[PDB]
Amino acid sequence: HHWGYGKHNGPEHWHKDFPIAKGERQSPVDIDTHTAKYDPSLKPLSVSYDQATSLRILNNGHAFNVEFDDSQDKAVLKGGPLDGTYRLIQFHFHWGSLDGQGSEHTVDKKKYAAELHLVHWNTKYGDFGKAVQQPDGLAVLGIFLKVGSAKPGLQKVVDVLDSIKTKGKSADFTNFDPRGLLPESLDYWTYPGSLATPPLLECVTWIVLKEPISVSSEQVLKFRKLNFNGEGEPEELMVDNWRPAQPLKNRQIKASFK
Numbered sequence: 001h002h003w004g005y006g007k008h009n010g011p012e013h014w015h016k017d018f019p020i021a022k023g024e025r026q027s028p029v030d031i032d033t034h035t036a037k038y039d040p041s042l043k044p045l046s047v048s049y050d051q052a053t054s055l056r057i058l059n060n061g062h063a064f065n066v067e068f069d070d071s072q073d074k075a076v077l078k079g080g081p082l083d084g085t086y087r088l089i090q091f092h093f094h095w096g097s098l099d100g101q102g103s104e105h106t107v108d109k110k111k112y113a114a115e116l117h118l119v120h121w122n123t124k125y126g127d128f129g130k131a132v133q134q135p136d137g138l139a140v141l142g143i144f145l146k147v148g149s150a151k152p153g154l155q156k157v158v159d160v161l162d163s164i165k166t167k168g169k170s171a172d173f174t175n176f177d178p179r180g181l182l183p184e185s186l187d188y189w190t191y192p193g194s195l196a197t198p199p200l201l202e203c204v205t206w207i208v209l210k211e212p213i214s215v216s217s218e219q220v221l222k223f224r225k226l227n228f229n230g231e232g233e234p235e236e237l238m239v240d241n242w243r244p245a246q247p248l249k250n251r252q253i254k255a256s257f258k
């Protein structure tokens with residue numbers, strides 16, 4: 001039937017409806033820090049999130065997305081390995097059933113408790129739907145979460161999850177500042193990849209930050225209470241909604257730092 005993360009519809013089954021699942025620029029991947037090439041021609045990232053406008057939070061049945069108004073150049077990413085302006089459309093998370101897993105990307109095979117993805121679309125393509133059809137259509141910022149101290153700027157998100165427990169539910173979610181979710185340093189790794197969920201289009205330029213942010217146990221605990229199912233259905237907790245590392249194949253991971 002339709003894809004998810006269970007035994008019967010899990011990532012190992014995805015190729016059957018999305019042949020691109022077995023492609024050349026599949027995501028995520030394991031980041032080998034010894035093999036990653038420091039590229040000194042890489043420019044510093046540019047994050048301008050001061051005019052960000054969140055609108056809504058939604059449970060789509062695979063994660064929760066916080067959506068932004070992308071009608072104009074309000075929250076954009078540029079620089080780094082990018083040419084042009086990329087507009088933030090949404091952000092979402094991937095997390096585990098336990099603290100030892102949940103991240104999609106891995107560092108020297110190390111898994112984090114969760115991974116945040118900030119989704120941006122290349123403005124030269126005019127809409128998100130046209131952007132995903134392009135090799136350089138999207139820029140996704142990947143941020144690792146480790147369990148430690150609470151992240152203050154994540155609390156507003158945590159607190160609204162009770163209201164979007166099941167699939168299809170959504171809530172009003174304005175005045176959220178995405179700046180609260182950034183690590184102090186913007187050192188990153190970059191490589192060419194794809195969407196980590198179906199349709200798995202090979203249209204992304206991943207930007208993975210070296211520095212993880214800490215969240216508390218209690219913060220991640222709230223994630224784990226969400227449901228994959230819609231209301232009035234047998235409860236299936238929303239956990240382990242992460243795709244395993246894929247073959248790097250013919251790709252090189254570049255580093256912005258030594």
Ligand SMILES: [Zn+2]
Binds near residue numbers: 093094196
């Ligand atoms: Zn994602």
